[PDB]
Amino acid sequence: SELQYLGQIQHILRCGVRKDDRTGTGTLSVFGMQARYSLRDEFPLLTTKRVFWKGVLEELLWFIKGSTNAKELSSKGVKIWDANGSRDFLDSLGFSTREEGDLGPVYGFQWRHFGAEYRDMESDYSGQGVDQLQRVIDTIKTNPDDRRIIMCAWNPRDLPLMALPPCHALCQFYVVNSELSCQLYQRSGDMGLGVPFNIASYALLTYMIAHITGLKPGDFIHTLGDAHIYLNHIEPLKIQLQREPRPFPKLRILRKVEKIDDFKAEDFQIEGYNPHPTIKMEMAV
Amino acid sequence: SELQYLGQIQHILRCGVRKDDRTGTGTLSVFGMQARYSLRDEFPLLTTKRVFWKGVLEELLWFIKGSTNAKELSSKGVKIWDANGSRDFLDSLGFSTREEGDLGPVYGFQWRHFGAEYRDMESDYSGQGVDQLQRVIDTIKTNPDDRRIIMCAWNPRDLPLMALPPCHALCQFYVVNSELSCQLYQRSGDMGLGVPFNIASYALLTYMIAHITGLKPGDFIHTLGDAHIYLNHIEPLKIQLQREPRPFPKLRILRKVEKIDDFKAEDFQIEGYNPHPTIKMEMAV
Ligand SMILES: Nc1nc(O)c2c(Cc3ccc(C(=O)N[C@@H](CCC(=O)O)C(=O)O)cc3)c[nH]c2n1
Ligand SMILES: Nc1nc(O)c2c(Cc3ccc(C(=O)N[C@@H](CCC(=O)O)C(=O)O)cc3)c[nH]c2n1
Ligand SMILES: O=c1ccn([C@H]2C[C@H](O)[C@@H](COP(=O)(O)O)O2)c(=O)[nH]1
Ligand SMILES: O=c1ccn([C@H]2C[C@H](O)[C@@H](COP(=O)(O)O)O2)c(=O)[nH]1
Structure with missing residues (x-):
């Protein structure tokens, strides 16, 4: 339920410790958290504030396509990665010869081409690396009892080439009683900005895979490392x-899709989303 | 084979007529020309001057992508369309409300969305209009004997909205004995600047389609309307x-590509290209 996230917010504000960080603003930090969000007949889109649903959907399709180019996501009206892909940010990391928008081997590259040699955001990687996303789907179809259905985005070899190392670094899937569940290990959680995105993002990914594999969505277990409030x-x-949470909305998939690459943005519809007004919160770059 | 281009240059300088034009600089003009460039085991990239091959390649991928935004091509290091997309140029055409870089419904829009109503360069046109490029490829696969395999960019309805009406306005493909040939009707040919680009551009496109359909490149017939020298x-x-032509280079495609949209700039490699020194020539805007 949503009260778990609010309980995590209240715990960090009351029991978090002051901690410096890579950005300039300090944080109130707590290490080690876990929450369980039901995916059964509801979708965990926060109601205590309006969550950018198009940003969640377009970013996930941007991940599935394997793209590491912020221009492709920004062209869809979702500018969440424009800051970490700007010219000044890349220059501050020493990426003086990298094109603007090239985030490096990040979520999209590691999901579909783990192990491939990263060149640039415009390079062709088809046939190179490990396709973790598809192997996850195939393992679910062929062996639901497998305890190794994992998609890992943390690539220690590719870390120096990333503009921002993966925050949601590893996720695992689990099947029992025809239910598909997902647990995510998030090494770093921006409780105000990224965490509501990530919770809705991996719930949507679980809905996609369950739709393809013919399973029913179960639970989403959100595991946090450095859960911090800026x-x-x-x-x-x-x-x-201080806002009273309202019931979670529902996610409807409008057509039968066979491959996860075939999903389009127009295939999804959030019903019953009545959130509180949006709360603007600045990004720490 | 290259002697045909040089013969046309010499023919315009010797028998061309003085003619004013839309720009300020005059021209030496000749109406009605034709040249045949063999694509068998060679690629017609001119050797009497170094041709910006990266500009030729990036522009075609920019065409196939359906983009009409000069900024997207300019971000790849190719500024050949920046002049016709500038703010002053669009203002001189009455496009005071147009965004900078928006060339209007041009090559990229007409190849993939012929007939759709043009809004702006960033609008979504997927599913709208006629996809001439894909219908060409599909017709070649299913009926190589068809005499209607044509991709036309000249749209009389969209002409007032274009920053520059298409110079290479119509191309036709032809299949016999498992050989793919292509003819281009170019209504207007900048013999010094655009024509060497256009010849290599449509030769590269013929290599792409032959690779997709499993055919061998044959001939490229370059038909010129107003062939003019500024x-x-x-x-x-x-x-x-005055430079002696050298053997044409070769074009090698590095991987088996299934759809023309999957082609990336890394998949192509020019081998044996030993051109004469680069010759700078200003563009007439
Ligand atoms: N410190 C920090 N925190 C983060 O949350 C991120 C992210 C992921 C992310 C998630 C959400 C946003 C964001 O600005 N969201 C907005 C939506 C509107 C918008 O895009 O302007 C909001 O809810 O206020 C921006 C980035 C990427 N990089 C981040 N760096
Ligand atoms: N009069 C006129 N002539 C043209 O050739 C064009 C074009 C297409 C075009 C083709 C090539 C260039 C161009 O600058 N080519 C250069 C490459 C190096 C460069 O960027 O200057 C060259 O080959 O010398 C510029 C524009 C677009 N608009 C044009 N208007
Ligand atoms: O999907 C994402 C992307 C970013 N962040 C936040 C966490 C941090 O506040 C910041 C990244 O900082 P580092 O931990 O990499 O220093 O971005 C998330 O929570 N989720
Ligand atoms: O691919 C191209 C694009 C442009 N041009 C040149 C031909 C003309 O000199 C100029 C267009 O001007 P108008 O013909 O519309 O006046 O661009 C070419 O030769 N090839």
Whole structure:
């Protein structure tokens, strides 16, 4: 339920410790958290504040396509990766010869081409690397009892080439009683911005795979490493914490899709989403 | 084979007529020309001057992508369409409300969405209009004897909205004895600047389609309408006419590609290209 996220917010504000970070703003940090969100007949889209649903959907399709180019996501009206792909950010990391928008071997590259040699965002990687996403789907179809259905985005070899190392670094799938469940290990959680995106993102991915594999969505287990609240998010989150949460919406898939690459943005519809007003929170770059 | 291009240059300088034009610089003009460039075991990339092959390749991928945004091609390091997409140029055509880089319904829009109503360069046109490029490839696969395999970019209805109406306006494909040939009708030919680009551009496109349909490249027939030499190109072309042509290079495709949209710039490799020094020639805007 949504009260778990609000309970995590309240715990960090009350029991978190001051901690510096890569950005300039400090954080209130707590290490080690877990929450369980039901995917059964509902979709975990937060109601205590309006969540950018098109950003969640377009970013996930952008992941599935294997793209590491922020221009392709920004052309869909979703600018969440424009900052980490800007010219100044890439220059601050030493990527002086890299084209703007090239985030490096990140989520999209590691999901579909783990092990391939990364050249640039415009290179052809077809046939190179491990296709973790498809092997996950095939293992679910052929062996639901397998305890190794894992898609890992943390590539220690490719870390120096990434503009931002993967925050949701590893996820595992689990099948029992015709239910598909998903657990995600998030090494770093921006509780105000990224965490609501990531919870809705991997719930959507579980809905996609369950739709293809003929399973029913079960639980989404959100495991956090450094769950932190930025200082410039303390007052906005204190406002969100005073809002009464409303029932979760529902996710309807409008057509029968066979391959995860065939999913289009027009195939999904969120029903019954009545959130509180949107709360603007700045990104720490 | 290259001697045909040089013969046309020499023919325009010797028998061309003085003619004004839309730009400021005059021209030496000749109406009605034809040349045949063999694509068998060679690629017609001119040797009497170094041709910007990266510009030729990136522009075609930009055409296939259906883009009409000069900014998207310019971000690849190819500024050949930046002039006709500038703010001052669009204002001189009355396009005071157009965004910069929006060339209007041009090659990329007409190849993939012929008949759709053009909004702007960033609008989604997927599913709208006639996909001439794909219908060409499908017709070749299913009926090579068809005499209607044509991709036409000249749309009289969309002409007032174009920053520059298509110069290579119509192309036709032809299959016999498992050989794919292509003819281009170019209504207007900048013999010094655009024509060497256009010849290599449509030769590369024929290599792409033959690779997709499993055919061998045959001939490229270059038909010119208003073949003109700009005044500020007379001395540069007189220098090029003194250089001995060298054997054509070869074009190798590095992987088996199934759909023409999957082609990336890394999949192509020019081998044996030993051109004469580069000859700078200004563009007439
Ligand atoms: N410190 C930090 N925190 C993050 O959450 C991220 C992300 C992922 C992400 C997730 C959401 C947003 C975001 O700006 N969301 C907006 C939606 C509207 C918008 O895109 O402007 C919001 O809810 O206020 C931006 C980035 C990528 N990089 C991040 N760096
Ligand atoms: N008068 C006129 N002539 C043209 O050739 C065009 C074009 C297509 C085109 C083709 C090639 C170039 C061009 O600058 N080519 C250069 C490459 C190096 C460069 O970027 O200057 C060359 O081969 O010398 C520029 C524009 C678009 N608009 C044009 N208008
Ligand atoms: O999907 C994402 C992307 C980014 N972040 C946040 C977590 C951090 O606040 C910041 C990245 O900082 P590093 O931990 O890499 O220093 O981005 C997320 O929570 N989820
Ligand atoms: O692929 C191309 C694009 C442009 N041009 C040149 C021909 C003309 O010199 C100019 C277009 O001007 P108008 O013909 O519309 O005046 O561009 C070419 O030769 N090939």
